[PDB]
């Protein structure tokens, strides 16, 4: 009545099931994951193969999907393992593993293509001729929540200029201490944006209203826009927590096709839901149910990122390995 199957609840894995669905419905990622050359891999320690297995089961099982081989492969297996890590670290663990496994293959560079951006930050001395520029690659964008009404205010905060003056005067080395500015602008924004909302600070949880839109235009935060490719982003996933830091229940909302038809993914129960439940009902306020992670897809890349996946996208070598595994266990 959905067409989508859920993930088993097998312990306090917090954000993990939400993230797994989120990555699974990044269809371009999914197809590249299927292409990884894992035939030689040791199952009990291969996270690239365990992610293939999970995606295979999500695409083909009609019953809820287990993850125990996956949490074994990356070694988080104690009661509170997932409560000592956060979703940004698990994102990096999964994406870096699969990135490396595609090095040297037909899908090499898929992870950077989908997820890498570039920024530039600078220090410009106000009163002598010295500037330091720093270009670096990024993956996700951590957005400050506390004291920000909406995602626009957070991006404004992200790129707000900082005065280095008086007591925090920048030392320009040869020039000694100098008044300077520090600032930031994005050079590029990747096809898939993972925005991490800083609700869980230090240990606390900010439950305040934080408004985020269905279509998110970001041209204003680039150093140079172009026309006929505006940085216009479409909301794909809303990863949600309920509670006050202490444990809590984790759920993800997705419109997997990018068409604004939303579903709620609540471990083994995938149910269909209103757009209001996915968006405005996760703004929070003063409710303690609210987004901590948003996934946006660039409008110009959406058809690309959400390209149809068929059974023919999963190699035979892999299908046969996974079905043989099932034979053994039975």
């Amino acid at each position: 009545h959905t067409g989508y199957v859920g993930l088993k609840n097998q312990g306090a894995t917090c954000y993990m099931n939400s993230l797994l669905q989120t990555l699974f419905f990044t269809n371009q990622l999914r197809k590249a994951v299927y292409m990884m050359p894992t035939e030689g891999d040791d199952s009990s320690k291969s996270v690239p193969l365990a992610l293939q297995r999970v995606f295979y089961e999500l695409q083909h099982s009609d019953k809820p999907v287990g993850t125990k081989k996956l949490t074994k492969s990356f070694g988080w297996e104690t009661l509170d393992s997932f409560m000592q890590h956060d979703v940004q670290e698990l994102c990096r663990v999964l994406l870096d593993n699969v990135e490396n496994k595609m090095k040297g293959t037909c899908v090499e560079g898929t992870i950077p293509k989908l997820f890498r951006g570039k920024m530039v930050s600078y220090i410009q001395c106000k009163e002598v001729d010295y500037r330091s520029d720093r270009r670096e690659d990024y993956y996700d964008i951590q957005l400050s929540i506390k004291g920000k009404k909406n995602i626009f205010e957070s991006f404004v905060d992200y790129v707000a200029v900082e005065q280095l003056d008086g007591d925090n005067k920048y030392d320009a080395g040869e020039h000694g201490l100098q008044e300077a500015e520090k600032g930031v602008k994005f050079l590029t924004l990747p096809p898939v944006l993972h925005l991490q909302l800083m609700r869980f600070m230090y240990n606390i949880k900010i439950n305040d209203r934080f408004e985020f839109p269905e279509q998110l235009p970001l041209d204003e935060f680039l150093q140079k826009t172009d026309p006929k490719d505006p940085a216009n982003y479409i909301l794909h996933a809303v990863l949600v927590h309920s509670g006050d830091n202490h444990g809590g229940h984790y759920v993800v909302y997705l419109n997997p096709k990018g068409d604004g038809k939303w579903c709620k993914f609540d471990d083994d129960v995938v149910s269909r839901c209103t757009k209001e439940e996915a968006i405005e009902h996760n703004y929070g306020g003063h409710h303690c149910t609210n987004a901590y992670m948003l996934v946006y897809i660039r409008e110009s890349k959406l058809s690309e990122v959400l390209q149809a996946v068929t059974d023919h996208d999963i190699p035979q070598q892999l299908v046969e390995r996974l079905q043989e595994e099932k034979r053994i266990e039975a």
Binding site: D96, D137, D140
Partner: peptide, 15 residues
């Protein structure tokens, strides 16, 4: 890690 001390692209260990 990025200029702002947030995590950047890839795996970078503990601060």
């Amino acid at each position: 890690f990025l200029x702002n001390x947030x995590r950047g692209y890839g795996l970078c260990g503990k601060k």
